[PDB]
Amino acid sequence: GSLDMNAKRQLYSLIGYASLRLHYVTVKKPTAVDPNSIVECRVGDGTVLGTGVGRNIKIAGIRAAENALRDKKMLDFYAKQRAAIPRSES
RNA sequence: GGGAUACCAUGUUCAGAAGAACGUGGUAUCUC
């Protein structure tokens, strides 16, 4: 895999629905002696789908995405939620 | 000689299912 296109898609194409809040948070302020940074993949609900770290951070970005789609159970979990979700959170 | 993160500003591209991310250059610290 290792394909962003695929990732980003899996996100706002396989799960990312209306009123999801899905969002990534950058953590580990890069350094000029180890730029490497990490990414947190979670949702406003306080749920982290996964994570991703890299030396040129990007790997971290794309890695984070692939991480979100790296949870078949989590993914499918939202699939059902999507069907349920009564025009709101609960 | 090469290489990288980031601030300030703006835009393109990735893909080609779907929709998102990265880049362009100005300055700088560090590093090989």
UniProtKB/Swiss-Prot annotation:
Entire-sequence positions represented here: 366 to 453 of 471
Anything else known: Present with 4970 molecules/cell in log phase SD medium.
Protein name: Ribonuclease 3
Domain DRBM: 6-74
Domain of life: Eukaryota
Role according to the record: DsRNA-specific nuclease that cleaves eukaryotic pre-ribosomal RNA at the U3 snoRNP-dependent A0 site in the 5'-external transcribed spacer (ETS) and in the 3'-ETS. In vitro, cleaves synthetic 5'-ETS RNA A0 site in the absence of snoRNA or other factors. Has an essential growth function in addition to pre-rRNA processing.
